[PDB]
Amino acid sequence: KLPKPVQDLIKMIFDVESMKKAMVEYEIDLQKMPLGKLSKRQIQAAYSILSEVQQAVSQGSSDSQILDLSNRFYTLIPHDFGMKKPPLLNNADSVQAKAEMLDNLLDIEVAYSLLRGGIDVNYEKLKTDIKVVDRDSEEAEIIRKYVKNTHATTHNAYDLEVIDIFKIEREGECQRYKPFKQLHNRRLLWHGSRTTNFAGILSQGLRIAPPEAPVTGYMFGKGIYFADMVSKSANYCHTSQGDPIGLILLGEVALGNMYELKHASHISKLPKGKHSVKGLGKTTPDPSANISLDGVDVPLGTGISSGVNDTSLLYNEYIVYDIAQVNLKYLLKLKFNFKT
Numbered sequence: 017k018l019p020k021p022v023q024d025l026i027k028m029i030f031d032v033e034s035m036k037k038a039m040v041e042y043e044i045d046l047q048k049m050p051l052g053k054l055s056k057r058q059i060q061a062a063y064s065i066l067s068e069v070q071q072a073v074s075q076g077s078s079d080s081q082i083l084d085l086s087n088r089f090y091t092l093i094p095h096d097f098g099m100k101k102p103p104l105l106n107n108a109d110s111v112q113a114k115a116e117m118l119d120n121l122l123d124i125e126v127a128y129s130l131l132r133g134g135i136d137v138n139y140e141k142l143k144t145d146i147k148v149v150d151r152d153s154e155e156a157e158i159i160r161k162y163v164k165n166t167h168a169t170t171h172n173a174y175d176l177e178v179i180d181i182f183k184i185e186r187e188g189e190c191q192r193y194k195p196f197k198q199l200h201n202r203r204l205l206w207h208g209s210r211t212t213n214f215a216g217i218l219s220q221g222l223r224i225a226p227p228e229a230p231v232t233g234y235m236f237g238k239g240i241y242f243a244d245m246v247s248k249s250a251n252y253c254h255t256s257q258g259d260p261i262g263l264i265l266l267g268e269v270a271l272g273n274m275y276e277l278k279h280a281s282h283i284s285k286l287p288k289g290k291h292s293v294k295g296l297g298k299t300t301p302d303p304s305a306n307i308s309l310d311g312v313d314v315p316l317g318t319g320i321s322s323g324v325n326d327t328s329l330l331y332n333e334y335i336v337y338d339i340a341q342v343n344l345k346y347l348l349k350l351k352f353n354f355k356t
């Protein structure tokens with residue numbers, strides 16, 4: 017007895033088929049490790065074979081001091097590689113590659129455990145008010161301008177079809193955000209992820225990567241990363257020609273004074289007076305077209321060449337370092353219409 021597109025959403029984020037599909041594309045042995053035998057008791061433990069492992073990658077531990085450490089990782093998380101010896105986590109892009117797997121397995125466990133514990137019944141245990149914003153409304157027009165308007169010419173392999181668009185109120189997130197409601201420079205920015213992660217995201221909110229996690233992949237370290245150009249967030253949906261429908265969040269992120277870095281720092285504590293970091297993009301929406309909804313700075317002009325050059329990022333990245341600085345306002349269901 018729920019609205020149609022929300023009933024479809026709840027199925028899409030709790031679909032066990034979509035999880036098992038992700039575990040053989042990650043090359044996990046589903047005979048040696050089903051969804052059931054996954055526990056959080058093995059999660060930080062999997063990071064334990066990464067925190068005390070990457071700590072042996074930058075000197076190169078030598079299989080006197082690696083083989084054993086790489087060995088105990090396959091005691092908790094087995095992997096099947098056809099008829100070839102198991103990849104050794106001694107090189108650069110392996111201990112990191114396996115870190116993106118857990119980031120998923122983490123919320124892959126959250127999804128199943130919420131689905132197994134206790135479709136209205138599963139919605140109940142997202143502790144979140146999901147309403148349908150209707151196509152024709154202004155509500156639904158400003159969201160669409162933004163999606164149409166802040167598409168990138170680098171990120172144009174696919175066109176961006178907007179299916180149906182929701183309005184999200186997570187339990188507690190209001191109270192939690194109250195402090196930062198009063199902080200200047202609040203922007204409704206984009207945050208895309210794997211559909212499987214949205215079990216976790218809606219139940220727990222956006223979390224900062226745990227401390228055990230591998231160093232890099234985090235350009236500015238362990239924060240909650242946003243962007244103004246939809247395509248760039250759209251990208252972390254990792255939606256494929258196989259399943260072309262993705263989910264992307266709009267959020268209110270209270271940024272106050274942004275620490276404006278044109279270059280990667282593993283920021284491990286902001287420099288007192290700064291409440292966010294802003295990676296400075298080359299491209300940016302005309303800061304003239306930047307609309308205001310409720311004291312929030314909806315940045316939805318189009319790509320202008322802000323000749324800011326001493327930089328690495330083609331488009332801006334917004335990072336906060338406190339989970340309380342975010343207040344998720346919508347969840348977007350959009351189709352990736354690909355072109356090769």
Ligand SMILES: Nc1ncnc2c1ncn2[C@@H]1O[C@H](C(=O)N2CCN(CC(=O)Nc3cccc4c3CNC4=O)CC2)[C@@H](O)[C@H]1O
Nearest residue numbers: 119206207208209216217220221222223241242243249252
């Ligand atoms: N409750 C939670 N518990 C664990 N992981 C959670 C979580 N809520 C979200 N996550 C998910 O974990 C992942 C994570 O933190 N990551 C992976 C991505 N990585 C780099 C990063 O943030 N880059 C980056 C940069 C710019 C925009 C965007 C991103 C990611 N998404 C975007 O829209 C930072 C660490 C991510 O996929 C997120 O969606």
